[PDB]
Design a protein around this ligand. Structure first.
Ligand SMILES: *[C@@H]1O[C@H](CO)[C@@H](O[C@@H]2O[C@H](CO)[C@@H](O[C@@H]3O[C@H](CO[C@H]4O[C@H](CO)[C@@H](O)[C@H](O)[C@@H]4O)[C@@H](O)[C@H](O[C@H]4O[C@H](CO)[C@@H](O)[C@H](O)[C@@H]4O[C@H]4O[C@H](CO)[C@@H](O)[C@H](O)[C@@H]4O[C@H]4O[C@H](CO)[C@@H](O)[C@H](O[C@H]5O[C@H](CO)[C@@H](O)[C@H](O)[C@H]5O)[C@@H]4O)[C@@H]3O)[C@H](O)[C@H]2NC(C)=O)[C@H](O)[C@H]1NC(C)=O
Ligand SMILES: *[C@@H]1O[C@H](CO)[C@@H](O[C@@H]2O[C@H](CO)[C@@H](O[C@@H]3O[C@H](CO[C@H]4O[C@H](CO)[C@@H](O)[C@H](O[C@H]5O[C@H](CO)[C@@H](O)[C@H](O)[C@@H]5O[C@H]5O[C@H](CO)[C@@H](O)[C@H](O)[C@@H]5O)[C@@H]4O)[C@@H](O)[C@H](O[C@H]4O[C@H](CO)[C@@H](O)[C@H](O)[C@@H]4O)[C@@H]3O)[C@H](O)[C@H]2NC(C)=O)[C@H](O)[C@H]1NC(C)=O
Ligand SMILES: *[C@@H]1O[C@H](CO)[C@@H](O[C@@H]2O[C@H](CO)[C@@H](O)[C@H](O)[C@H]2NC(C)=O)[C@H](O)[C@H]1NC(C)=O
Ligand SMILES: OC[C@H]1O[C@@H](SCCc2ccccc2)[C@H](O)[C@@H](O)[C@H]1O
Ligand SMILES: *[C@@H]1O[C@H](CO)[C@@H](O)[C@H](O)[C@H]1NC(C)=O
Ligand SMILES: *[C@@H]1O[C@H](CO)[C@@H](O)[C@H](O)[C@H]1NC(C)=O
Length: 986
């Protein structure tokens, strides 16, 4: 790396520049493959734009796009085109992270399962691995190249590879020829924007200056609390990073300090704590302490992983996680932005985007007892000659939940001042951190200092507006350099509030003190109007940007200090636009509230909200107060237990009339899997035969030699898998699984056999996905699925041979549903047949009354070990044009219930794997777009009873969240193909 290849996106020690403007990049991670509803991407982009972010970072999952080697397919729900179009329409730039390896808690870390057939070490310059990535990178980097800002699109940065940060013992690292080949694939496909990496820690790998394989901007990650959400209140000693400014200067001082992934939640395994408990660990307190600590080090490219997590639908996740990928993120899986951490993150995004002085201030060492007489707080200064200083304050024990009283002594253009200058003390409550400022520009005005935090400011036609906030009951002070100008008359005016005090010095510096509370204080100083609110009130303010013109209209007048309107009230403000003499607002409301609009453009006299005109009151400061009609209706949804359920047996394999003549033979005598050399005479690894997704089945023929024989069977499905065995129709046993078991050794007696007769063992092995490969040189993604080893011995100790057949999804890599992708289906009979698809062939199913002996309902289940599939039509008629109504399917986990596994299908998409004896997921959201809110839907539930007494689903319900009156763009239903009989199925 030797400089920029283009002049649109450039950089220096302090920041990125976009179109010549210095900017703080504040980005949220979103994975387009985890939300297969193209019309919903604009919804998530409006929610992230409203935080004050300007960028989204995204992965691309190779395993979904090249499920058949040599056939790259990114059409329909797999196209990035609607994702790019929504970023341009929202005014968001993108950091593209296509891998090939992405990790991401996805199956294989993004590697397709056919890489288990590649001998060479993954993520090295073994040429079989390198060349296996070429077709994918050539296609995905050319699609990203067309979307670069240099071509009028949203992409501004590209990440090659992922967290290339160490290697197994004895493996070359860093492997600079490998790194360089991955760069060359991107540059050869037309990527000309800067390249950025994401080292796990500040190891220096790939930094500028390291020669072959170096990127343009050195990036690293941070997950300081880890990923285990067992104790969400516990912040352990030494958890806060305190060395990153000096580590940056030691590794890559020529480029901006960049945290390309920083903790926005945590992943959660089977048997984990649930994502509500992750959201309690990475909560609003974590954001204010840890994210302001990154500002203390001068971060200027900062991406929060995850900002919206989505769902691991269609088996796309790895075994170390389950169906949800809510991640505890600021935006929930079902897209709601009610968590307090969302509103706290918005206060920080809105501050940085009006604060260009922060970019060129220089961060210095943290101090204790230097900028305050108190030693109970630590203060990190960011200092500049004239353009303004910033001071990050935290408790000395960063974990402290105590409240401290303090004052500060800060450098200013008027000299060093102990603040408050008018008396009193500041307060830092538990797990809080503040940024205080000196010589902070507010348009034409200047804050000589402020203890209160800045939410936003802007210069409008008739006034300049500044919004300041504090936690409740905190005293704050700020000072404004002479705001009157030449005026002899001019004096402050108190507009609202009865606690604020005003003091003027002889040189006309105005000093204001106030104590934050629910009651806003407002003071006018000439044409400057200051609004002083508490934190909880500031959570409800929004700063939508005014559009510019042309294709890039949504990016506004500039990235920093954009033309804006300030709006107090609402669950979300998505956008504003000027339409003649009207201001038109798009907004969502989850509760009733008024709206106050601050900074009305000149000549505008009409207001609309969500396309409906409304009147307004005018305040003495020229703000509008409007009262939109907000009706939050009671929503009734259908009771699932009352739908007409149909049932089909999904284990016909164990009946004596089953014909397996169409099954693939498991007759490969060698494997290319170098990670797990064969122990058996033939490969029984699914991926060796093209089966990489979901449940596998094996059928083993043998001729009985003695009446009793002993079977040893070693199966592997990934963490929290299970396996079940039958001898002809006789149930032998199950390995019922647990969170810590990815394989199992099982021994069974096969008794009462007729010597000379042929028997068939049917073995079902679930797979919870392919493992990741996060240590280069340890080929962990190659861990196979299926049968690792076996032995069948007679009662005299002779070895008895078994000949095998197997299946996964019908077709393997020639998978049958091109619309829903290569991973959606496993190998269970009902999946193979396509019986999970909309409008299934009801002649092949049975129906009978619930609670009866012939019930076809999953609530009645089955009375033996086995596998059944249940399907029902679910009509919905909900007011989706006006409301966003999140729906989910909830299983009851009754303490007395036999163990089972279940699969949830909605309109042909697999949207849940439920494991009754492992957990933790019971509630499975499914988005509108996959569900049709004004038409028929098909839902499906597979039931796998693991023990001999059978199983049933104890309760299953459709649940709704409180409806949100919405101004989103309309959600279009995803039109997947319906059932058609499959030729060659079995
Ligand atoms: C319906 O209700 C029922 C009844 O309530 C629920 O059933 C209950 O389910 C729970 C959870 O599954 C289950 O408890 C677990 O039991 C298993 C099995 O143990 C038993 O069997 C084994 C095998 O014979 C014996 O050897 C044992 O003695 C025991 O008899 C056990 O492994 C679990 O242990 C974990 O949790 C304990 C804390 O609760 C710990 O003390 C353990 O050390 C262990 O801890 C792991 O998991 C914790 C939770 O995630 C985690 O905090 C901790 O750090 C550690 O994580 C590591 O290991 C786990 C694997 O165990 C792994 O998942 C993690 O991996 C992730 O993280 C890595 C590092 O970042 C990452 O690399 C990786 O990719 C990630 O995936 C990590 O390596 C636990 O005791 C109960 O037995 C069961 N009760 C009954 C009566 O059946 C049921 O769940 C409910 N169903 C629904 C749908 O909700
Ligand atoms: C409609 O959409 C809106 C959003 O637009 C949703 O509103 C959000 O609802 C969520 C869920 O209820 C709210 O989050 C939860 O908030 C509660 C209440 O606490 C908050 O509000 C009170 C004021 O009512 C504040 O006093 C709280 O702040 C104090 O305490 C927190 C510690 O909780 C501390 O960090 C603060 O600094 C502050 O401390 C000061 O006061 C305390 C008390 O006097 C004092 O001891 C201390 O010294 C300081 O002086 C706080 O802002 C909160 O209890 C919950 O937290 C718990 O759960 C989460 C896990 O879920 C954990 O992360 C956390 O650790 C706690 O265990 C939640 O944070 C959210 O605030 C609210 N947002 C807005 C904008 O209103 C609606 O729900 C939606 N409604 C519908 C129908 O859809
Ligand atoms: C830093 O402050 C934290 C937060 O108060 C302290 O953590 C507490 O430690 C006590 C005593 O061991 C526990 O009983 C509390 O439950 C902890 N509280 C929380 C919320 O985790 C911590 O010990 C202090 N660290 C140092 C070095 O002083
Ligand atoms: O959700 C976890 C994420 O971890 C990071 S590596 C982070 C390595 C690290 C771990 C702990 C502290 C610091 C860095 C990956 O790049 C993501 O794809 C995703 O898997
Ligand atoms: C092993 O890899 C080679 C590609 O080098 C291929 O020709 C062969 O069929 C593979 N064999 C198996 C058993 O996957
Ligand atoms: C199964 O047993 C074999 C042979 O003893 C051993 O190599 C292997 O580690 C065992 N696997 C498990 C999951 O216990």
């Amino acid at each position: 790396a030797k400089g920029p290849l283009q002049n649109i996106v450039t950089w220096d020690e302090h920041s990125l520049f976009v179109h010549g403007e210095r900017v703080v990049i504040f980005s949220g991670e979103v994975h387009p493959f985890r939300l297969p509803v193209p019309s919903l991407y604009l919804d998530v982009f409006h929610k992230i734009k409203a935080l004050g972010f300007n960028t989204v970072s995204f992965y691309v999952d190779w395993a979904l796009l090249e499920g058949k080697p040599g056939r790259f397919r990114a059409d329909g729900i797999f196209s990035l085109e609607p994702f790019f179009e929504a970023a341009t329409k929202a005014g968001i730039y993108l950091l593209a992270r296509p891998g090939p390896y992405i990790n991401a808690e996805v199956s294989g870390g993004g590697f397709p399962g056919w890489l288990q057939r590649v001998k060479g070490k993954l993520r090295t310059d073994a040429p079989d691995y390198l060349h296996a990535t070429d077709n994918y990178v050539a296609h995905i980097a050319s699609i990203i190249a067309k979307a670069q800002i240099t071509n009028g699109g949203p992409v501004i940065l590209y990440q090659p590879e992922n967290e290339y940060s160490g290697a197994a013992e004895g493996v070359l690292f860093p492997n600079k020829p490998y790194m360089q080949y991955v760069i060359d694939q991107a540059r050869n496909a037309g990527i000309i924007v800067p390249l950025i990496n994401n080292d796990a820690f500040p190891g220096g790998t790939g930094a500028p200056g390291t020669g072959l394989g170096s990127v343009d901007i050195y990036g690293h990650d941070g997950y300081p609390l880890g990923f285990d959400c067992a104790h969400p209140s516990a912040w352990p000693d030494n958890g806060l990073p305190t060395t990153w400014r000096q580590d940056h200067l030691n590794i890559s001082p020529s480029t901006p300090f960049s945290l390309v992934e920083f903790q926005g939640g945590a992943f959660d395994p089977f048997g984990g704590w649930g994502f509500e408990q992750c959201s309690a660990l990475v909560n609003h307190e974590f954001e204010r302490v840890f994210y302001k600590n990154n500002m203390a080090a001068g971060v200027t490219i900062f991406n929060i992983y995850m900002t919206f997590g989505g769902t691991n639908w269609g088996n796309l996740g790895h075994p170390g996680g389950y169906t949800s990928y809510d991640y505890g993120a600021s935006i929930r899986e079902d897209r709601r932005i009610d968590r307090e951490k969302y509103s706290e993150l918005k206060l920080q995004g809105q501050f940085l985007k009006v604060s260009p002085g922060y970019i060129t201030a220089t961060p210095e060492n943290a101090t204790q007892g230097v900028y305050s007489d108190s030693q109970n707080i630590v203060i990190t200064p960011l200092l500049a000659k004239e353009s303004g200083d910033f001071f990050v304050v935290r408790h000395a024990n960063y974990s402290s939940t105590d409240t401290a009283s303090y004052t500060v002594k800060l450098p200013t253009s008027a000299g060093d001042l102990t603040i408050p200058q008018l008396g009193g003390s500041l307060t830092l409550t538990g797990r809080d951190s503040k940024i205080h400022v000196t010589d902070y520009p507010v348009g034409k005005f200047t804050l000589l200092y402020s203890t209160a935090e800045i939410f936003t400011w802007n210069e409008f036609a008739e006034k300049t507006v500044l919004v300041l906030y504090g936690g409740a009951q905190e005293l704050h002070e700020f000072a404004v350099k002479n705001p009157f100008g030449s005026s002899k008359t001019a004096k402050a005016k108190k507009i609202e509030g009865s606690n604020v005090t005003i003091h003027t010095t002889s040189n006309l510096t105005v000093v204001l003190q106030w104590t934050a509370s629910s009651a806003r204080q407002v003071v006018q100083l000439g044409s400057l109007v200051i609004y002083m609110v508490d934190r909880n009130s500031a959570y409800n303010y929004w700063v939508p940007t005014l559009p510019g013109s042309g294709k890039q209209s949504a990016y506004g007048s500039s990235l920093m200090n954009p033309d804006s309107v300030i709006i107090n009230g609402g669950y979300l403000i998505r956008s504003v636009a000027i339409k003649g003499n009207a201001l038109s607002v798009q907004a969502d409301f989850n509760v009733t509230t008024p709206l106050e609009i601050i900074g009305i453009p000149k000549g505008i006299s009409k207001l609309a909200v969500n396309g409906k005109e409304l009147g307004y009151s005018v305040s003495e400061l020229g703000d509008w107060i409007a009262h939109p009609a907000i009706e939050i209706p009671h929503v009734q949804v259908p009771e699932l237990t009352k739908l007409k359920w149909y049932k089909v047996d999904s284990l016909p394999e164990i009946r004596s009339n089953y014909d397996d003549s169409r099954w693939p033979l498991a007759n490969l005598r060698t494997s290319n899997n170098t990670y797990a050399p064969l122990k058996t005479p033939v490969s029984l690894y699914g991926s060796d035969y093209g089966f990489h997704a979901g449940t596998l089945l094996f059928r083993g023929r043998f001729t009985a030699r003695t009446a009793r024989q002993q079977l040893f069977l070693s199966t592997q499905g990934g963490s929290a898998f299970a396996s079940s065995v039958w001898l002809n129709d006789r149930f032998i046993g199950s390995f019922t699984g647990f969170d810590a078991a990815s394989a199992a050794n099982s021994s069974y007696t096969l008794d009462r056999l007729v010597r000379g007769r042929r028997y068939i063992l049917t073995v079902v092995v679930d797979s919870t996905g392919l493992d990741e490969n996060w240590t280069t040189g340890d080929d962990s993604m190659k861990a196979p699925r299926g049968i690792l080893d076996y032995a069948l011995t007679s009662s005299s100790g002779a070895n008895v041979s078994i000949s095998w057949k197997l299946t996964g999804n019908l077709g393997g890599e020639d998978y049958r549903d091109v619309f829903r992708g290569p991973l959606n289906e496993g190998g269970l009979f009902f999946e193979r047949q396509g019986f999970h698809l909309p409008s299934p062939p009801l002649s092949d199913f049975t129906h009978g009354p619930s609670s009866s002996s012939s019930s076809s309902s999953p609530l009645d289940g089955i009375a033996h070990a086995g596998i059944a599939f249940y399907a029902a039509k679910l009509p919905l008629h909900l007011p989706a044009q006006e409301y966003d109504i999140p729906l989910s399917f909830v299983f009851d986990n009754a303490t007395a219930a036999a163990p089972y596994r279940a699969l949830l299908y909605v309109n042909g998409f697999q949207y849940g794997k439920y494991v009754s004896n492992i957990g933790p997921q019971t509630e499975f959201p499914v988005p509108e777009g996959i569900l049709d809110y004004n038409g028929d839907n098909w839902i499906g539930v597979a039931l796998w009873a693991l023990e001999s007494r059978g199983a049933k689903v104890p309760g299953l319900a459709l649940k709704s969240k409180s409806p949100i009156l919405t101004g989103r763009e309309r959600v279009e239903v995803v039109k997947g193909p319906h059932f058609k009989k499959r030729h060659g199925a079995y």
